[PDB]
């Protein structure tokens, strides 16, 4: 949120979930930020470069996160063909 002067007004911009596009609340302890790292070439060396998949509380409680991580990384191309 900005004003007419063009300043950054909001205190903190919360994490929008990568599954349901919902804002994770401050007291929402049932959320998680999954971390999966990138893979190198034919040698198969581990990278410090990683990617973050945010999963929120209702998705984690309903169990949609299991299919959600694979259907989110399928657009990346890192989980499957």
């Amino acid at each position: 949120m900005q004003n007419d002067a063009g300043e950054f007004v909001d205190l903190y911009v919360p994490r929008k979930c990568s599954a349901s596009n919902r804002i994770i609340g401050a007291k929402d302890h049932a959320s998680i930020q999954m971390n999966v790292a990138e893979v190198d070439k034919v040698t198969g060396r581990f990278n410090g470069q990683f990617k973050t998949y945010a999963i929120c509380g209702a998705i984690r409680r309903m169990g949609e996160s299991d299919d959600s991580i694979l259907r989110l990384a399928k657009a990346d191309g890192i989980v499957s063909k």
Partner: protein
């Protein structure tokens, strides 16, 4: 039995948003519903939608975003004059900056913001935010 098909659409939209699904199956098709979803696309709350054209009556599949908090249909479709929209502003929209109201005007399906510039007014289908 079967009436207010825009409300029949938005109930499925509302339950899919509250469940957290990706896309919706909506069995009626009205040009009211098509222009309603066109306004929602133009304001960007929903995504791409495909109307499977059945021979009798098709089925609309809307790729959801996750943005829609609440959308519904005001039932009897009140006939609304200008200088009376502020009642619906204070009754429907959660704030001044946010939300939109769908005014069926005399020149087509329009918006609450579009109606004060077109200076037409008319009926109200519902609201979406």
């Amino acid at each position: 039995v079967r009436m207010n098909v825009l409300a029949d659409a938005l109930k499925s939209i509302n339950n899919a948003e509250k469940r957290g699904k990706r896309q919706v199956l909506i069995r009626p098709c009205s040009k009211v519903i098509v222009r309603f979803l066109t306004v929602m696309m133009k304001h960007g709350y929903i995504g791409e939608f495909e109307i499977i054209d059945d021979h009798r009556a098709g089925k609309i599949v809307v790729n959801l975003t996750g943005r829609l908090n609440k959308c519904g249909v005001i039932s009897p479709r009140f006939d609304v004059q200008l200088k009376d929209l502020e009642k619906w502003q204070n009754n429907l929209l959660p704030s001044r900056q946010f939300g939109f109201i769908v005014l069926t005007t005399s020149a087509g399906i329009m918006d609450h913001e579009e109606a004060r510039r077109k200076h037409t007014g008319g009926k109200i289908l519902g609201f979406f935010f």
